[PDB]
Amino acid sequence: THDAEEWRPPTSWELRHVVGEGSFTGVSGAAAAALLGMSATNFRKYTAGDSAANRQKISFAAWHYLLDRLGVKRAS
Amino acid sequence: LSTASVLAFERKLDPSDALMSAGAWAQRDASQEWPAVTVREKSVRGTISNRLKTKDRDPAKLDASIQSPNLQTVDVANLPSDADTLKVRFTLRVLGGAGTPSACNDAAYRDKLLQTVATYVNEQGFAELARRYAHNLANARFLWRNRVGAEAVEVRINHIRQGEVARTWRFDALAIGLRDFKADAELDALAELIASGLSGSGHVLLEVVAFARIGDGQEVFPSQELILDKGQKSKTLYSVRDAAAIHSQKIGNALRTIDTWYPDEDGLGPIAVEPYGSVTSQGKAYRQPKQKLDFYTLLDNWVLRDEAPAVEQQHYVIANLIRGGVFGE
Amino acid sequence: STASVLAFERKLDPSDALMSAGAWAQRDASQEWPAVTVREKSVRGTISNRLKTKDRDPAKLDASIQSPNLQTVDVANLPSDADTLKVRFTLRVLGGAGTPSACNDAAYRDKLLQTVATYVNEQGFAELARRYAHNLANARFLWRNRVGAEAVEVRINHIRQGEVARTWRFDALAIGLRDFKADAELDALAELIASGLSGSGHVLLEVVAFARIGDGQEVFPSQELILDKGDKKGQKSKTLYSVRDAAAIHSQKIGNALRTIDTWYPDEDGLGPIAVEPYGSVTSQGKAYRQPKQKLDFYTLLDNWVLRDEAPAVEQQHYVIANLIRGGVFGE
Amino acid sequence: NAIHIGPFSITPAARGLHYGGLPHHQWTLYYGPREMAIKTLPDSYTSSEVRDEFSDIIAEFVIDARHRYAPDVLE
Amino acid sequence: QELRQFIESFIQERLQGKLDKLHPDEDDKRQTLLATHRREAWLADAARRVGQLQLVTHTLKPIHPDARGSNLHSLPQAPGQPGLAGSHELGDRLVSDVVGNAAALDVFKFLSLQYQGKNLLNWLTEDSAEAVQALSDNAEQAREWRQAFIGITAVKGAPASHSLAKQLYFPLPGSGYHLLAPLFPTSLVHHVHALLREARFGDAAKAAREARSRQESWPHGFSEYPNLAIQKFGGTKPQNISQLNSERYGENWLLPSLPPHWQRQDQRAPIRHSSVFEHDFGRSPEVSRLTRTLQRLLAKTRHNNFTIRRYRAQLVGQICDEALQYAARLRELEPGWSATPGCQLHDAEQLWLDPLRAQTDETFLQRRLRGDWPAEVGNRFANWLNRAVSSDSQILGSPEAAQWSQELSKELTMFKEILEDERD
Amino acid sequence: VTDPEALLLLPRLSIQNANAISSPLTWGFPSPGAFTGFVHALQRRVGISLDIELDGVGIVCHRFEAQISQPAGKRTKVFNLTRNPLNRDGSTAAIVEEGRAHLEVSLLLGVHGDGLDDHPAQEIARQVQEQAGAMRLAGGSILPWCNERFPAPNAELLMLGGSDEQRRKNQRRLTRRLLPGFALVSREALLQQHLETLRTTLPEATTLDALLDLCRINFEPWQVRDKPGWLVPIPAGYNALSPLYLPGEVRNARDRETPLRFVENLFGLGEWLSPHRVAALSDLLWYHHAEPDKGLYRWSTPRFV
DNA sequence: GGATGGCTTCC
DNA sequence: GGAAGCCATCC
């Protein structure tokens, strides 16, 4: 959703739908990290698997901008 | 003088496949046109019941697994809703002439074998083995799970010389236990018939039927099958021209449970006669080769180094010869 | 001497024996009996092999027990109502026994021609034909199905044109597997065989056998030759021979069942008549009788008979002419 | 040891068996909490072989998901 | 120059590999003596091995391992009759395989590896100074090595065959025969085995495979071979043909050469009403493939209208021939004519398209079926065929669709004439 | 070359374990050279005793049944073997791979001699039947007469007998007998024009045979390229490697009285056609003809279209 | 698993 | 002596 009040961050399993070599877009973690202007390590911080095991949620803006740049949602 | 490279043995006591039919009690003497029971399908909802690997023990993951159960379809077999008696019929064939191997290399080896088994025949007949075989036919061991919790089970045994009946029997298979070997006049008469067959003194062909009183529309248990992959079906049964059936090797394994001479204990009861006599139900081997009581060491101690063991161990070795298999290197 | 190239073509060509089943006392009506099919079933066994005995080690034995062992096999049974098995095959006899299909040198060719002319002019085929009519009289071709039977019955029919020439029937269990006696019907069959072997033409037979076994018991057709040689998953451990969705026996198996005539192997006589082969080697015992170290193998006996003209006795003559009628490819 | 191909997971079944004399293992292909296929594969298989054993089912699922959730067309 | 130093380094590496299998009792001194003898006289030891080896393109041992005859290295001329297949088609990319002893094969592989790098593979005959300067062999040793290499490059065989070859006859025109011994080609099957491996395996092959899984169509081809057969040469060790059989692992893939219907399946001839309705359609595997091809060929243009019309006429003729053959196979495959219970229109079609009036059929019905041939069955079959072919107003409005309708009418008339000639 | 005047048909032959491989590249039906050799041996055995020469063979292949199996892990297919008897040591044998198959073929033969003149057609058909019932075709013996005693009789048919429409209706009454089968002819001209098409790409010769008998799947502009008939590879014959050798110049020969050649197999293209797509039956007879100036050893079917 | 031999190795 | 035979080792 575009409304910030109802949005929740995705989990790792949902996030593997678009990032990773097995995903449907077929884009790497390194290329997606370069698409957001981050390091590879800080991007790997997002896809650890559980927030207790050193994992952070992604932001609203980074998530929607990443969906924009991959050609999934238009996100005007 | 050593053991041969190859050694093959055919099997005596060849059974048929046993198929099932259903009908009413007290009409069991008219049971020649009873319709067969059939295999259908139904769908079952699986649920989570296994142990967990201490990583799948978050409550959220557990409830998320509870939310989406998997579905399966599964074969089943029941009695009809009005009949209450299960009829199982098969055919046993006793061969005789059990000493000779069907394949061999060293002639002196098989000659030593032949005189060993001839001396065993001369000392004792087959009366102990035939008595125990007729015991395993008296109670219905071949009714594997269908015997469990049955109301009353009766069995007719019928001798076939030409195309007609020679002599019959009948029993109450619940009166005969599963544990011990008793004595009975009809039973030893049948055992004498089997012993006459096993000595090669005339061929014996038997057909056995068995009736089990269970209940209306209850579940019966045919033999199962093997599934390598699925994408759908997860359990299949065995059938011959659309009639539920039991494998022949299941009947043969239910017939050879006569071994009461394993060194471990006696409270367990008789087991089947195997080299390194084992049970898959317990995952454990009696007659370990560390003890000097498995089949192979007993065999080449009787033949090559000429130690006749105890007489019941000679019964065990002769039963392993009757079952037959692949020996050698 | 003998040529570098030598080859004989096979006489007595049999057919693939198809199997069918039905009930006893209807075997005269057995022109439409249904076939016997092959099915599959699943088996689970345990370990019963002689293990290496340096790895007995009871913990590892109980470990190797608790992983199960599953296979898929083939099976062929009679139906639950029938109790009789019917096997049928044909047999073509050619004649012209001596002549090879290939010879590099003509001198050994016409020397062999004249010495087999002498052998056929000395005595007839009646010994070999009597033994062949014996091997068709008892049903040796029912390899394992004959074992432990109840009553066996053969029917042999002579076929000249598209109709029956003459018929025969026997009781195959009265004739043993042991010796070679004589019988007027058997000697008439031997007369037919000796005429057919004489180059007279193509004599054609149709043989049908019967056996009381029982209801729903198993029969034994041929097996196949499969080589594994692969990383992939295990195949089914047994496959049977079928011809147009009906169980069958191979032609070479019944052909090997026919030539079990040689009782003159020099080692003993209590083991019985065997097939005829150059330095005759059975596969059941894995051992070659008539060793070429002795002068009773086929090659040395022939080279004495035709080249050095050292004629052996009549038994070795029967042996070498049986190896001639078996066919083969010889040479260096 | 599991194998992860995007949102899919391929796990073995923790105790093998002997089929045709050779040791085997059961494998399961998951899509989240939903189990899709089960095969029985022998050992001495590298992970690439276990990948392209299931690659076709993955591709078919992709084809169906692409056709079902296609967007609308104006003209 | 550098090639002989590389050969000496390869000999030292072979000595180190022979010292890798070292024994703790006496392997060290024997390995040192063998390395000293190798580094001294590798060429002198290899000349006697290179005298034993011969290069060959046709071999007799694949016919049978126990036979032995003349093995020939020769490229025959291209025949005059055009459009054939032989060894003459390629000359530039040959690879000859050699028969000989295994240590001799190691020596020949060392000679071929010394033949690489420089131009030594073609200059093993014409080179003295640089080769003797690099290899450490003298002038006399270089001359003896050149003589041994010229001898090993030669055939060195006597013309003779064996008793286990084929050596067949072929009659001459109006006269006698010749004996014709066939030899197994090995360079040709090594070449086409490389091409078949490249067809079945390769980055372009797997890329076109995942392309045809994703239907992304970049400019590329995709080849596929169905139902090969596999043959195995000899026993467990394959190199006894040659080293080409060592690298092919004793395997040769065979191409299918089969009759059309080589899977004899049971016929669903029996009297089902829905079975008769589906048999009026006649959905089979080859019939379904032909119907799919005909439906795919409907949306074509008229720019290739000559070739498109030829392909459409060929497809229609193949469909008509397959329908007639399937009808004949269903008729002759039928043992008897049974009265079908509720065969809706199946009796009306099988008055002619069914078997003769047997004992199960009525004799009056058989005489009535002989009175009138099944022309209406042909009309119903033409209607089912025209319903199977997707038509539209573009064919009715276009002249090419009118020509296709005329061709289909001519094919239906030929089928009706062939049915009526046999009918009655 | 020559036009046959009488056509004789062998109705339905039942053969077991004939050779399946018959070539170092294919493994389906056996070679037509075996059919030319069979009719030549039929001429040499008995056909000289009734003053006929025989020219060409016709085959229809009613049924096919090979002993082949699939090894449960791959798309290829493996052969069935037989057990050779023991070596004298008793260990094993040298394993050689062979292909057995069962066939069902009708044999169509042409004639040129005094067919109906010296004797009627029925008796010469019966005697050539009794001649043919004792041989083998490609290593496979003929199974004898069984309960198929109904296709026992044969019939000779005169080629140009009667009028042209009478010849046409006799041809139609004859092809009403060979219903479930397919004839096999050479189709080299299709290979010529296809090679001429791909010569615009590049000048390769064996690729024209290789690419015309696969399943090429084309990229979308996900489709397949089609060939209109049943194009099947076939061994065309032989091309020699060596010149002609003298009857004693080579050792271990079959016969030391005939000259010898060392040859390589030649391959071509065939097609399985329906019997009702041909006009004349004289278009499907396999003649063996020789060119001893070169290594050309050819069987073919001239005068087809 | 075919090929060549090398010291034995008979007769 | 010479051959043949076996075994052996190579690849």
Residue numbers in the entry:
A (entry chain U): 153 to 228
B (entry chain G): 6 to 236, 241 to 338
C (entry chain H): 7 to 338
D (entry chain U): 2 to 76
E (entry chain A): 11 to 434
F (entry chain B): 3 to 223, 239 to 322
Task: Please give me the paper's original passages concerning this structure.
AcrIF24 forms a homodimer and further induces dimerization of the Csy complex.
Structural superimposition between the two complexes showed that dsDNANS and dsDNASP share a similar binding site near the hook domain of Cas8f. Taken together, dsDNANS is bound at similar sites as dsDNASP in the Csy-AcrIF24 complex. In the structure of Csy-AcrIF24-dsDNASP, K247 and N250 of the Cas8f subunit are involved in dsDNASP binding, as revealed in the Csy-dsDNA structure.
